[PDB]
Amino acid sequence: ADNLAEFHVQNQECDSCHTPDGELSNDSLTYENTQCVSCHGTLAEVAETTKHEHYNAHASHFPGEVACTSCHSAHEKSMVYCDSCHSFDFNMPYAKKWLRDEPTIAELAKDKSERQAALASAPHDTVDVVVVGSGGAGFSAAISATDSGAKVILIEKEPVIGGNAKLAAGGMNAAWTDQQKAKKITDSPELMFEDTMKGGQNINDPALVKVLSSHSKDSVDWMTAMGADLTDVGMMGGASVNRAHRPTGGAGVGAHVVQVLYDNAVKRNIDLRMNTRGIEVLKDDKGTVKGILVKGMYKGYYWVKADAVILATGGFAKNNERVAKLDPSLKGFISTNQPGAVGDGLDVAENAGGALKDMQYIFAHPTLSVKGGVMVTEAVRGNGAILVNREGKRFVNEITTRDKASAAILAQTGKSAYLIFDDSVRKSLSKIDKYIGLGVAPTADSLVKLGKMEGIDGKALTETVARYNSLVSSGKDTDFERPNLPRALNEGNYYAIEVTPGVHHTMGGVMIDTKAEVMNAKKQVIPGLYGAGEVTGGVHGANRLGGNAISDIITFGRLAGEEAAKYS
Ligand SMILES: Cc1cc2nc3c(=O)[nH]c(=O)nc-3n(C[C@H](O)[C@H](O)[C@H](O)COP(=O)(O)OP(=O)(O)OC[C@H]3O[C@@H](n4cnc5c(N)ncnc54)[C@H](O)[C@@H]3O)c2cc1C
Ligand code: HEM
Ligand code: HEM
Ligand code: HEM
Numbered sequence: 075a076d077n078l079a080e081f082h083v084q085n086q087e088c089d090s091c092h093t094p095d096g097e098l099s100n101d102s103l104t105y106e107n108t109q110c111v112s113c114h115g116t117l118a119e120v121a122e123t124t125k126h127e128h129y130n131a132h133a134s135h136f137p138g139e140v141a142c143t144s145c146h147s148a149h150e151k152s153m154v155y156c157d158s159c160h161s162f163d164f165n166m167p168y169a170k171k172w173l174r175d176e177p178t179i180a181e182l183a184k185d186k187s188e189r190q191a192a193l194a195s196a197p198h199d200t201v202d203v204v205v206v207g208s209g210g211a212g213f214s215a216a217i218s219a220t221d222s223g224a225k226v227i228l229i230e231k232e233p234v235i236g237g238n239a240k241l242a243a244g245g246m247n248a249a250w251t252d253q254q255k256a257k258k259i260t261d262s263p264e265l266m267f268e269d270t271m272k273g274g275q276n277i278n279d280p281a282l283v284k285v286l287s288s289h290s291k292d293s294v295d296w297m298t299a300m301g302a303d304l305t306d307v308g309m310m311g312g313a314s315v316n317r318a319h320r321p322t323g324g325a326g327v328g329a330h331v332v333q334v335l336y337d338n339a340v341k342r343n344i345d346l347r348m349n350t351r352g353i354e355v356l357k358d359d360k361g362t363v364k365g366i367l368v369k370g371m372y373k374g375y376y377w378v379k380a381d382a383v384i385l386a387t388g389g390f391a392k393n394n395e396r397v398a399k400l401d402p403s404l405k406g407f408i409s410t411n412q413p414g415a416v417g418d419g420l421d422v423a424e425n426a427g428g429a430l431k432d433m434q435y436i437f438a439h440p441t442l443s444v445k446g447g448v449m450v451t452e453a454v455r456g457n458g459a460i461l462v463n464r465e466g467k468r469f470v471n472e473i474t475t476r477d478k479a480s481a482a483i484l485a486q487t488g489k490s491a492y493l494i495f496d497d498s499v500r501k502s503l504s505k506i507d508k509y510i511g512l513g514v515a516p517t518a519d520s521l522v523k524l525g526k527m528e529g530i531d532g533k534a535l536t537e538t539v540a541r542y543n544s545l546v547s548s549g550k551d552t553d554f555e556r557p558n559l560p561r562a563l564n565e566g567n568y569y570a571i572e573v574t575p576g577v578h579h580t581m582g583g584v585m586i587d588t589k590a591e592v593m594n595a596k597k598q599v600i601p602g603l604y605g606a607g608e609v610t611g612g613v614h615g616a617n618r619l620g621g622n623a624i625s626d627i628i629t630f631g632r633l634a635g636e637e638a639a640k641y642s
């Protein structure tokens with residue numbers, strides 16, 4: 075057979091997969107996927123038949139209920155979503171190579187006739203609020219608005235939920251929590267505010283940073299009440315004390331928080347539509363929001379009538395052409411992001427009248443794995459790892475801020491460096507076991523043996539670790555002034571991870587006020603239009619601090635949902 079439907083129709087009727095009238099159930103293909111599951115079993119049952127020692131297409135780190143049609147189309151060949159970041163050895167029936175080819179919002183002007191027909195029709199649905207994007211900001215705003223009394227529709231352009239938030243590792247910053255008190259830490263919302271303004275070179279909007287620090291404990295309390303575990307508290311650069319919260323043992327904060335938000339949306343019966351892209355905000359004759367035009371992958375263009383629209387579409391760090399226009403030094407670099415993080419949400423905001431700010435400030439994460447092409451969290455360094463070059467020596471403060479770590483790594487022999495750690499560091503952060511499972515953390519019982527494996531001067535490496543352990547013991551790093559020295563590297567075996575920089579977060583974006591209301595260039599509010607998360611500018615300023623982005627999306631996402639509900 076040439077395709078999957080042709081294969082099944084050799085011994086099955088069309089209604090084995092389709093509804094009685096033959097029409098597609100909706101853009102999420104809910105009915106059709108239910109039939110795949112009735113015969114083959116759930117994703118977890120299918121995964122028992124496709125095991126590999128260290129990977130499995132049907133059992134991954136993605137949260138929520140991943141639909142079979144995310145990767146298996148029926149009437150045409152299709153792509154494996156995992157190939158957008160990894161290169162595993164797979165053999166999916168009727169596959170084709172991964173290629174992302176999505177028209178820009180400007181290119182969709184080509185569909186004038188279909189768009190005009192949709193807008194002349196009655197609205198397909200009439201609700202109070204529409205939320206655009208299924209990352210942390212978007213789920214937070216849909217749950218908040220629903221709990222306040224509003225009827226919502228939440229849309230997502232990709233086949234799977236969670237955006238870049240499902241990948242988060244290091245933690246969520248907050249201050250003066252009960253979680254901190256149980257680990258004997260002393261902090262305050264005022265210290266969190268001060269660290270954040272210094273971190274962004276005092277370019278941040280102080281009104282927005284006051285919302286970020288003052289609502290942080292409440293945001294941790296809200297997530298925990300919905301079922302989250304945010305009890306492990308670690309350190310990341312730029313923080314005066316430990317304040318990055320994550321699940322017990324040091325697991326990743328992102329897949330866990332997105333799973334808790336999805337389960338709470340399902341409990342509240344929130345209308346969630348996959349494969350549905352927001353295209354154009356609609357306004358009445360007085361310039362206030364009246365609804366939004368969307369494009370369903372399977373059902374076509376239609377529009378939804380509503381009092382408010384909340385844009386929660388994330389950043390543009392995967393779009394290297396747009397990145398290079400703003401910062402030529404980043405042209406050609408790899409990215410840490412999901413395939414759809416390209417900035418189409420900003421284009422929708424701008425067409426509606428919103429102004430942008432701080433677009434030139436773009437962060438390249440210093441440590442992506444050379445072998446695996448994926449981010450290695452700053453928490454590996456925060457829990458104690460060091461960085462060495464091919465000469466076997468230290469060369470930078472590993473928890474330094476701004477762009478100092480990426481610049482220092484690019485200046486070393488080969489334009490890359492190595493993270494070095496032991497079994498005490500490994501046992502302190504469970505996320506490290508995920509890098510060992512991927513095959514990117516070679517190990518040996520001595521530093522001389524490990525250097526011989528990876529091309530690092532082994533005798534100099536041994537001396538370098540002995541010296542660093544001496545500075546940990548005395549309590550001061552006189553070589554590079556690293557301000558936190560949590561453990562000596564001296565238990566069990568040693569590990570190395572080869573790293574280099576990659577494009578990661580866009581700190582600029584749409585202008586918002588303290589109520590998450592979008593504004594134009596004259597600072598006038600556009601009634602009914604809201605923005606929250608990485609699509610906004612002004613929270614982080616000229617440089618970001620690790621752990622502040624997840625704090626931002628929960629706080630500003632919940633706030634926008636409450637405000638849009640009251641406005642409606
Ligand atoms: C690998 C990785 C690890 C990270 N780790 C951390 C961490 O530990 N701590 C931290 O503070 N930050 C971390 N960050 C940053 C933080 O996760 C992001 O800034 C956060 O994902 C922003 O969330 P958001 O809700 O604004 O957007 P996202 O989570 O990116 O979600 C946006 C969603 O909107 C959808 N969308 C876009 N345009 C449209 C459209 N037109 N119509 C419909 N849907 C659309 C997208 O497809 C996407 O699913 C990390 C980032 C990455 C990439
Ligand atoms: C989109 C919906 C479905 C998906 C994604 C799916 C998935 C698959 C795949 C990938 C194969 C292997 C093809 C090959 O070897 O070339 C397969 C085969 C098969 N499918 Fe499906 N399927 C779907 C619907 C169904 C339904 C509704 C039924 C039963 C009525 C069914 C029964 C079978 C059977 C019997 C086989 C052959 C092997 C076996 O005995 O399991 N499938 N399916
Ligand atoms: C001769 C038998 C079939 C007929 C006439 C038929 C008809 C159609 C039509 C007309 C569409 C497109 C609808 C639109 O664009 O609005 C479609 C899509 C689809 N059909 Fe079928 N179908 C048949 C068999 C199957 C089988 C056996 C399966 C599953 C194994 C299946 C699953 C799907 C799915 C998942 C879609 C969405 C798009 C895609 O994945 O290709 N159909 N079908
Ligand atoms: C309940 C949901 C799904 C069903 C029922 C389904 C069905 C199947 C079946 C029947 C096979 C062939 C297995 C064999 O007999 O060897 C298969 C293979 C495969 N499917 Fe799925 N699939 C589902 C979801 C997905 C998703 C969401 C993805 C990607 C994220 C995916 C990617 C693959 C790949 C990559 C293979 C080949 C695996 C390998 O070579 O180890 N499938 N699927």
Ligand code: HEM
Pocket residue numbers: 128129130131132133134135136155156158159160241243326410411412413448449508509511512
């Ligand atoms: C269903 C699709 C995918 C599968 C089956 C898969 C599989 C894996 C596996 C086997 C690992 C090693 C650790 C573990 O066992 O969990 C891993 C790690 C990782 N993957 Fe994926 N992957 C998928 C999609 C993606 C995509 C699309 C991205 C990026 C947008 C991504 C980013 C990462 C990262 C950053 C890690 C490092 C460890 C961590 O942060 O937990 N993966 N993946």
Ligand SMILES: O=C(O)/C=C/C(=O)O
Pocket residue numbers: 242243244245450451452453579619620621622623624
């Ligand atoms: O885990 C990380 O290093 C990413 C942190 C962040 O972007 O805040």
Ligand code: NA
Pocket residue numbers: 389580581582583607608609610611
């Ligand atoms: Na931003």
